[PDB]
Amino acid sequence: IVLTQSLSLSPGERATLSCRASQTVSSTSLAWYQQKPGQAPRLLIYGASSRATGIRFSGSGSGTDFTLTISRLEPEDFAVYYCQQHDTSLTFGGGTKVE
Amino acid sequence: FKNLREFVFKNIDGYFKIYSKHTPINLVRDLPQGFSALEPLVD
Amino acid sequence: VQLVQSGAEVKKPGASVKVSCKASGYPFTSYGISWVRQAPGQGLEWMGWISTYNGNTNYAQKFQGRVTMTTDTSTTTGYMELRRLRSDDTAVYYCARDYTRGAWFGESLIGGFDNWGQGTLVT
Amino acid sequence: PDDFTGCVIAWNSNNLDSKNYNYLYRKPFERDIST
Numbered sequence: 279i280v281l282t283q284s285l286s287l288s289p290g291e292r293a294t295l296s297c298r299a300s301q302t303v304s305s306t307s308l309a310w311y312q313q314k315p316g317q318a319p320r321l322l323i324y325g326a327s328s329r330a331t332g333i334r335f336s337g338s339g340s341g342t343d344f345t346l347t348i349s350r351l352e353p354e355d356f357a358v359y360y361c362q363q364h365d366t367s368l369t370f371g372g373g374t375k376v377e
Numbered sequence: 378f379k380n381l382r383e384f385v386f387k388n389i390d391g392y393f394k395i396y397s398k399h400t401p402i403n404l405v406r407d408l409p410q411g412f413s414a415l416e417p418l419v420d
Numbered sequence: 421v422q423l424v425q426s427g428a429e430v431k432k433p434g435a436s437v438k439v440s441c442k443a444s445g446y447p448f449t450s451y452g453i454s455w456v457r458q459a460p461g462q463g464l465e466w467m468g469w470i471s472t473y474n475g476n477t478n479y480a481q482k483f484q485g486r487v488t489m490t491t492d493t494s495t496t497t498g499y500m501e502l503r504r505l506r507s508d509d510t511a512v513y514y515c516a517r518d519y520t521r522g523a524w525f526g527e528s529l530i531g532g533f534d535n536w537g538q539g540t541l542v543t
Numbered sequence: 544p545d546d547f548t549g550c551v552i553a554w555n556s557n558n559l560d561s562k563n564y565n566y567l568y569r570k571p572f573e574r575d576i577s578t
């Protein structure tokens with residue numbers, strides 16, 4: 279399965295990030311990651327909407343259309359976010375940069 | 378016959394319990410007369 | 421919990437590289453090791469997943485026949501051997517703790533890759 | 544079993560499984576999947 283991802287916003291603004299799947303997903307096998315420049319990615323959301331331990335961040339969606347939102351951007355949110363699907367093998371989207 | 382192998386097969390509450398015993402024999406007719414007890418190996 | 425990997429290496433095409441990963445802060449047996457590749461300017465690619473319990477390994481089609489993964493539970497480590505390297509393989513190779521698949525049963529789980537190492541750069 | 548020893552643990556999965564008609568239904572621990 280192939281994931282396609284689709285951000286210029288100031289700190290304090292609400293951000294919406296999204297990914298589309300070529301095929302439907304079990305939903306519970308959707309995860310989102312955050313990768314700061316110079317650092318390894320970390321898990322933010324798993325199970326479509328559940329928040330990972332240690333993580334304003336929230337996930338949701340169904341079928342082939344899912345999102346990740348940040349209620350208010352911080353200077354530390356200016357990272358590349360990734361959409362991961364792992365119900366049938368494993369795949370990631372290209373990634374979305376937030377500035 | 379030179380070797381005797383005995384088994385117990387029972388199916389209880391979804392479990393298939395297997396007991397067995399191995400012992401040498403010297404008899405070309407049927408099962409030798411005698412006594413031994415079989416022990417559980419597989420469940 | 422912390423994952424640590426080896427430093428960077430430079431290889432010529434046709435050469436092999438052995439990328440090591442060590443981890444601590446948790447029982448090793450219950451979590452698998454996921455290898456994820458990221459070429460400069462690119463996104464994340466799943467390479468494979470290995471069970472630290474029984475040795476079962478799943479691989480992404482792109483690396484099948486090229487990469488062999490193994491584990492050693494006595495040192496709390498895992499290794500990824502990449503054979504017949506190409507210039508196309510210049511990338512950072514990340515080791516991550518993996519809870520998207522069961523270490524004991526091999527079934528899909530509701531989770532993700534939580535604790536990542538720093539990434540080993542191989543040219 | 545009537546003399547069952549163990550623990551039964553359960554939780555709501557409305558936000559995990561529901562959409563979903565892929566869950567089918569009709570001795571102790573007998574699993575009869577004949578159709």
Ligand SMILES: *[C@@H]1O[C@H](CO[C@@H]2O[C@@H](C)[C@@H](O)[C@@H](O)[C@@H]2O)[C@@H](O[C@@H]2O[C@H](CO)[C@@H](O[C@@H]3O[C@H](CO[C@H]4O[C@H](CO)[C@@H](O)[C@H](O)[C@@H]4O)[C@@H](O)[C@H](O[C@H]4O[C@H](CO)[C@@H](O)[C@H](O)[C@@H]4O)[C@@H]3O)[C@H](O)[C@H]2NC(C)=O)[C@H](O)[C@H]1NC(C)=O
Nearest residue numbers: 321323324328329330331332333519530531532533534535
């Ligand atoms: C099913 O998976 C659930 C999620 O698992 C996590 O996420 C996945 C993607 C992987 O990364 C996996 O490795 C993660 O663990 C799992 O839920 C988790 O259960 C553990 C307990 O085993 C929880 O750890 C404890 O957290 C509390 C603090 O919780 C508060 O703060 C967090 C901040 O993120 C909030 O999200 C919570 O809602 C709370 O507000 C700690 O205080 C606690 O430490 C104390 O207890 C431990 C022993 O357990 C002692 O050693 C310490 O010294 C302390 O006394 C733990 O750290 C974890 O928070 C929880 N995560 C979530 C998101 O719910 C679930 O248990 C799994 N089910 C089964 C059957 O395994």
Ligand SMILES: *[C@@H]1O[C@H](CO)[C@@H](O)[C@H](O)[C@H]1NC(C)=O
Nearest residue numbers: 390391570571572573574575
């Ligand atoms: C096993 O099959 C027989 C028919 O040969 C049936 O009468 C019996 O009820 C079945 N037992 C169980 C536990 O389904």
